Amino acid sequence: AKMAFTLADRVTEEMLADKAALVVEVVEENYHDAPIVGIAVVNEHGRFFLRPETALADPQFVAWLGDETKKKSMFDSKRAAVALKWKGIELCGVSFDLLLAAYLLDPAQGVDDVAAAAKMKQYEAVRPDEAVYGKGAKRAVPDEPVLAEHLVRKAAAIWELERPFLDELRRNEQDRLLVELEQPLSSILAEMEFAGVKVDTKRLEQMGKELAEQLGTVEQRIYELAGQEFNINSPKQLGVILFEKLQLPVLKKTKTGYSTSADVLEKLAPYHEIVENILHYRQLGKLQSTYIEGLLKVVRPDTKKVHTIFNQALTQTGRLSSTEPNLQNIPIRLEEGRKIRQAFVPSESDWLIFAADYSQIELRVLAHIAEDDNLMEAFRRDLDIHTKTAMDIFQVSEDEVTPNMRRQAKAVNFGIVYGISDYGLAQNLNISRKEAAEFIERYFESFPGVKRYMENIVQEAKQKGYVTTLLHRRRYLPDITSRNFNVRSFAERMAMNTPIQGSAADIIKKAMIDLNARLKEERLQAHLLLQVHDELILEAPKEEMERLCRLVPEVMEQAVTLRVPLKVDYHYGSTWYDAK
DNA sequence: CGATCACGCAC
DNA sequence: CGTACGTGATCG
Numbered sequence A: 001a002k003m004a005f006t007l008a009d010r011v012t013e014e015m016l017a018d019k020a021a022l023v024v025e026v027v028e029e030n031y032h033d034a035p036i037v038g039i040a041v042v043n044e045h046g047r048f049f050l051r052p053e054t055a056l057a058d059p060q061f062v063a064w065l066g067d068e069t070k071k072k073s074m075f076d077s078k079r080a081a082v083a084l085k086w087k088g089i090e091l092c093g094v095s096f097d098l099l100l101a102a103y104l105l106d107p108a109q110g111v112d113d114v115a116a117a118a119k120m121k122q123y124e125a126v127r128p129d130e131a132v133y134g135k136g137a138k139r140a141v142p143d144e145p146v147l148a149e150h151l152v153r154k155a156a157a158i159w160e161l162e163r164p165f166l167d168e169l170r171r172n173e174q175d176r177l178l179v180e181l182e183q184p185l186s187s188i189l190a191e192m193e194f195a196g197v198k199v200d201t202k203r204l205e206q207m208g209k210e211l212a213e214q215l216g217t218v219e220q221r222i223y224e225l226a227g228q229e230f231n232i233n234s235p236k237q238l239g240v241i242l243f244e245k246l247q248l249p250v251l252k253k254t255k256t257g258y259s260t261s262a263d264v265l266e267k268l269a270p271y272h273e274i275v276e277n278i279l280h281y282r283q284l285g286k287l288q289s290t291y292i293e294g295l296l297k298v299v300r301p302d303t304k305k306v307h308t309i310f311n312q313a314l315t316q317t318g319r320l321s322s323t324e325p326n327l328q329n330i331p332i333r334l335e336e337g338r339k340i341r342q343a344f345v346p347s348e349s350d351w352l353i354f355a356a357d358y359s360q361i362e363l364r365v366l367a368h369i370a371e372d373d374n375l376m377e378a379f380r381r382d383l384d385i386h387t388k389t390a391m392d393i394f395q396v397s398e399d400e401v402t403p404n405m406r407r408q409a410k411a412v413n414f415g416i417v418y419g420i421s422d423y424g425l426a427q428n429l430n431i432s433r434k435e436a437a438e439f440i441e442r443y444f445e446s447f448p449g450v451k452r453y454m455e456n457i458v459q460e461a462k463q464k465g466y467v468t469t470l471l472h473r474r475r476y477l478p479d480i481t482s483r484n485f486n487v488r489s490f491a492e493r494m495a496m497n498t499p500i501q502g503s504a505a506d507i508i509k510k511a512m513i514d515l516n517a518r519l520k521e522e523r524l525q526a527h528l529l530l531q532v533h534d535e536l537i538l539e540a541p542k543e544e545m546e547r548l549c550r551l552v553p554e555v556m557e558q559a560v561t562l563r564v565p566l567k568v569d570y571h572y573g574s575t576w577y578d579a580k
Numbered sequence B: 001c002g003a004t005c006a007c008g009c010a011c
Numbered sequence C: 001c002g003t004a005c006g007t008g009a010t011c012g
Ligand SMILES: OC[C@H]1O[C@@](CO)(O[C@H]2O[C@H](CO)[C@@H](O)[C@H](O)[C@H]2O)[C@@H](O)[C@@H]1O
Pocket: A029, A030, A031, A076, A079, A111, A112, A113, A309, A311, A312, A313, A314, A323
């Protein structure tokens, strides 16, 4: 059953053909400055394994890697490209990435190794990575014969599966989505991750100290008000204090005990002074554990940068996610947590942080896809969309919209985008199902095009088996035909929400590609650092701000043409916090 | 010692 | 009511 290959001791010309499947193996999950443990090449001339110390010191091999006219097919080329950037080696000419291809064909399969992708086309002559390397404490690179066979089998699978994957993408009208959107984006994400974001660790450490002080003060107040010391971070020890010793009302349960989620606590606050303190303690503790201690844990001590990894092949809607650290969930709503962003600073002297965000991109996308006359007109007038929604559903003039009315209309707008449900809206606004249902009815009366869209997209999902986004991303929804109400209803909300969230993802991905091309044409030093779903964060010399103020919003606004304008706001400053 | 829960942070 | 990730506590 074994697969034949040459275990090479040196690089030869036949390993440098102008088309090959290439494996540059990095086993560490976080590939930043990580070891390359082996290399495999499969091409018209045969199958080869190379030790990295050999290949990466070979000028002909390094030149071949960097030659855009020598085409490579890979799985997770970003991992290889970043590991190689840390070694000062450029990887070019990647014309097919099997991870991205599998992800576009069906994000729900959770493909995260070559074996998983291969199994989609009944190809099973390759082992799962976890079977070869193990996981956790037991993880390890195996001896060379085992490692080499595995890497060659992966390269061989890629070599075989490129054509059938590309053919299916073409049938789905997704080939341009792979080749013109996701693959070029992967190179841009590699650059962003490698550049990293500079952290002011002294500032973080100062914050940590002050937080520790306040945590102590609140911890003691809590013990004083409880008349006893306990582990506040145990939802179970806390449940006893709250609902037994102090007799607070049980407004909600969890399947293992009493709920102490913030929504429940907020309702209990009027009964006892301890509750406000538990909330404050939780807020501070979140900042301390996750955003100070957690961040400091992953800052590289030499450069004081953090280098996130953007998972490009995970979310079911086409968004990116971010890990180690997650730079897509840094606090902003509450001023206390917002100050964390003061610690993210430009990487060079006299540079600044520039941040540009789409204004209401999801509702603008909804206006476009639903062709709702009222919603399109609202955005053509650049109205405050929550005030407008309040005017319509509560039937009042702009003057007559109160803050509470705008607040409830805002929640309705979220619900509509998420996949509206009377129960979920009711939970969010703390009102009755019947009341939430009345709001939803008034909304559909004011935006009948949106109502028609929500009905039609659920029927389309049922008919075709999937829904699609602007640039032809797809999500299969098998549960749409379930005879279980709750299962089916969740699938219906995904049918409604995915073309909205996913088309917004497509637009900002295209914007990133267009922006990098413009930055290069203009030879600006400015470069992307982060994407947070509907916003792009850059750093640049202070002397480039004026040019960026014009260039970045324009590129983002013009990335696609919709039936309504796109609008981008922007800010810049000496830290991420100040880019407001 | 990995897997799970409950919770809270972003958009 | 949609999409994510990290944490401390607990589970087994
Ligand atoms: O390299 C990213 C790419 O690798 C995958 C596995 O194929 O995820 C791995 O890499 C991560 C980043 O360090 C981890 O978060 C993840 O646990 C790990 O399996 C893909 O999911 C991802 O696109």
